[model samples]
Target: TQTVLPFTGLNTPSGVAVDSAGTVYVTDHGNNRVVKLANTQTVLPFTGLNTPSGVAVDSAGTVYVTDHGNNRVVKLAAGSNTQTVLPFTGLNTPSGVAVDSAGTVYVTDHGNNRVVKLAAGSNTQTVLPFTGLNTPSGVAVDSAGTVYVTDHGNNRVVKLAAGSNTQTVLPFTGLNTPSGVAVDSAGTVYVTDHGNNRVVKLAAGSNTQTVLPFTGLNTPSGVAVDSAGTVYVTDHGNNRVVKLAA
Candidate 1:
C-alpha cells in the first residue's frame, strides 16, 4: 500500500523542516521536544519550548522553532546551545515557520491568522498580517521570495509577495483542508490535504499535475522537499515518516 520507513520513535511529530544537507528537524509535540535526525534520530537541546509546532533551518544550519504554547518563535543560535536566538515575544500563536536563502525567517501565527517575518539582521518583526486567513498553518518561500502558506481552517493555499500585502497567487480552487505546504527548487508545490488524507502536487505556474493518494496516511501534517525532488511527508496520525517520488 504505502512505502513506509520505520523511524522507530517519532511520535506526534507536528512540524518538519529540512536543512540543505538533508538533515531534519521535527517538533515532537507529544514528547514536548525538538528532534534532530541526520542518519539517526536524537533529541536536541531546545529549552523553554512548550508545544513547539514548526521548524525552519537556515543555510548555516541554524534552526528556528515556533513555540505554540509560549506564543513565540525561538531559534537555535549558530552552532550554539539549543537556545533562543530571537525570542519573538508577544505573539498570538506561532505555528509554522520557513526561511529564505538570505536567512530571512517566516513564521505563521495561527492564533492571529497571520505571518510574521524576522529579518536577517533585525530581530522579531511583523511581515505579512492578513485578516482573511482563518488558520494559517504552514509557510514556505521559494528562491524568488514568493511566500506560500497553507490556510488550514479555510482550506486553501495562498501565495503572497514577501514583505508586501498584495496576494498574487491563489491555487486554492480545490483544496480540502490543506494543512502543510512545501516548494521545491523547480518551483513545484507540495501540499497535504488532511481532509482528503492525500498529498497533491501543484506546479509552480499551474494547477495540481498529480494527486498522490495514500491509504495509510491517517493524517498527513507537514511536508518537505529534497534537492533531488523526493517528497518526504510526516504521518501525524501514525507517527511515522514516509518518502515518495514526485
Candidate 2:
C-alpha cells in the first residue's frame, strides 16, 4: 500500500480518474485546478476552473472535467494544458464524469438530479435526460457501456444498462452517502461509501457485498480500478490518494 500527498498539494480534492497510461488526474476542488500525477512532481493540466468536481480520461488520452461551479464541462488534451469547453448547455452543478470505450461522455448532473449523455466528437446533448436519479454524484461506465451511478440522496447505486432506459438498482444496502464508483473488468463494482468511511465491493453479477480490508480511510470520495484490478481511492479528508493491492 502506498499513500501519496501530491507534490503540488491538494486542497479538498474530490473526483479522480486514471488514464490508459497509468497517469492519475485529480480535480483539486479547493485550488480550482486539475493536476495529473505520473512519476515525478505533478503538473497542472489546466487552471481557471470553477470548483472542478469530476475528472475523466478517454482512450485517446483526452481529459474531461466537470466544471461544477461554472455549470459546464471542459476538455483538455493529455499532452497540453489547453482547454476547450464542450458545446452543450443545461448542466446544473455537474459532479461526476466518465467516458466509455466508444468515447461517449456521461455526466451526473447533481443539481439537476439527472444524468446526461454527450456524443463523442459531435458533443451534442441527448434529446432526453436519464431521469429518476436522486442527487447522483459519481459515475462510471463499464466495457459494455453500462453506467453505474452513485445515487447519493437515495443511498443506492443505479445501473443504466446500455441501450436501455430501464434502471436496475443494485441490491445490498448499508450505503450511506456513496460518492465515487468504479467497475473492474470482471464486473465487480467498487464504491466509496463516504458516510460509512469505508469502501464496499459489490461482486459483478451476484451483487454480493464485501467490505474491503483497509484501515485509516478518511472520507474517501473517488475510486478507480486499474487493469490489474488494484483499487485507487481519493482520501478527501487526508488530502491524499491511496492505492490498495488487488
Candidate 3:
C-alpha cells in the first residue's frame, strides 16, 4: 500500500533530478509543488498543480515538470513566478520527463503507454515506436541520446539508442514494478524498483545489474544520478528525498 510519513517537510515527494552542477530538484507531489535544494530549500513559483509527478532540468538550467493531475507538462525558467504548459494535446498522466543536450524534451506519456519526443523549437509530438509498452512511468536520456524508459506495468526497463527507433529491453528479469529511471552521462543506468523497494544499477556496457545498498526506502519512486556519480532518490513512502555521496 502507498503511504507518506507523518511529519513536516516533504510530503510524498515523487520525482527528483540533479543538475550538472549538483543542484537538486524534487517534485513535492503531495505538497503540490516543486522544490530546489542548495543554500536553502527553495520552492519554484508554480501554482495550482494537483500532482507533479516527475521533474527534469535542461542543460540551460530550466526546469520541466510532468503535472500528472492536470494531464499536462509544465516548464519554469530559473527565475520566474509564471509557468508555461508545454504545447501538447492528448497527454494523459505524463509521468516522467527528460531533456537532451540539445534541449529536446522526451516524456513518458504513461497513460498513453508511449514516449513522446518534442525536438527543440517544435510543437509536433513524435510518438516513438515502442511495442507493448504497458504503462511506462519513467524516462531518461543519456548524453548520447540513448533513451532509458521504465516500463512499469511490464516490470522492465527499455533502451533506445540514439539515431535509431528500435526498442531494446534490458535483461533484468527480476524487476518488479520499476518506476523511475536515470542514466548518467557515462551510461550507467539506475532504476527504482518500487514494488521491490530497491534501486538497481547497470554499468556502462554491462548486461548484468546489481542492487544498490539503500535502506529505509519504502516505495522509492524517482531517482537521479549526476555526472559525478552522486545520487538522489525520492523515498515516496517516507515522504522525503534522500541523497548519497558520489
How well does model 1 score by local distance difference test?
0.78
Name the regions of candidate 3 deviating beyond 4 angstroms. 1-8
Better of 1 and 3 by lDDT: 3
In candidate 3, where is summed lDDT lowest over 10 consecutive residues?
1-10
What is the C-alpha local distance difference test score of each model?
0.78, 0.80, 0.83
Clashing pairs for model 1 are none
Task: Find the number of clashing residue pairs for candidate 3.
Answer: 0
Per-residue error (Å), model 1, residue 31: 0.8
lDDT of 2 by residue, 1-246 (tens): 555545466777787887776778788888888777786556466766778888888888888888888898888765675778887678878878888888788888788788887888775687333566678888888888888888889789888777777777887579898899988888899989998888889897785688887678889998887787778788788777777777
> Against the true structure, candidate 3 has what lDDT?
0.83
The C-alpha RMSD in Å for every predicted model, in order, reads: 2.1, 1.8, 3.4
Cα-based TM-score, every candidate: 0.91, 0.93, 0.93
